[PDB]
Amino acid sequence: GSHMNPPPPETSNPNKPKRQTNQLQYLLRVVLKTLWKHQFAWPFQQPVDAVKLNLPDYYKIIKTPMDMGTIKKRLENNYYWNAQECIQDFNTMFTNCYIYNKPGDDIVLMAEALEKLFLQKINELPTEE
Numbered sequence: 705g706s707h708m709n710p711p712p713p714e715t716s717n718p719n720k721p722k723r724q725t726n727q728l729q730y731l732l733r734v735v736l737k738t739l740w741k742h743q744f745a746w747p748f749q750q751p752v753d754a755v756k757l758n759l760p761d762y763y764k765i766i767k768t769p770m771d772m773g774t775i776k777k778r779l780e781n782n783y784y785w786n787a788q789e790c791i792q793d794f795n796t797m798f799t800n801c802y803i804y805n806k807p808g809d810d811i812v813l814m815a816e817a818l819e820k821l822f823l824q825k826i827n828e829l830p831t832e833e
């Protein structure tokens with residue numbers, strides 16, 4: 705894409721230790737599956753393209769970007785050591801939306817619907833075995 709967008713968050717690095725856990729499997733098979741297919745997922749399925757959206761200040765304000773396309777790759781390509789890393793990525797994505805946008809903007813309402821589903825699913829995150 706454009707040189708004016710930052711490189712996306714890391715999704716591959718052999719030096720980072722990796723693990724499969726039952727919790728990370730739940731995050732892929734239950735949490736990501738649920739949110740990815742939601743009617744309101746589409747703004748969150750890839751990094752924000754601030755050039756295409758004409759938001760030149762986006763990456764001036766958002767210095768810790770995250771999106772569900774990145775999270776999907778991280779889950780599918782076993783990037784994580786634990787569930788907390790992945791939950792933090794979802795929380796970062798939601799907070800980016802809430803910080804950048806006005807409350808009640810359409811994307812904020814969309815994020816809030818996804819976050820409500822996320823919370824329900826994370827409250828049922830299984831005990832680590």
Ligand SMILES: Nc1cc(Br)ccn1
Nearest residue numbers: 708754755758759760
């Ligand atoms: N100068 C710029 C930068 C971005 Br990113 C988008 C539009 N104009």
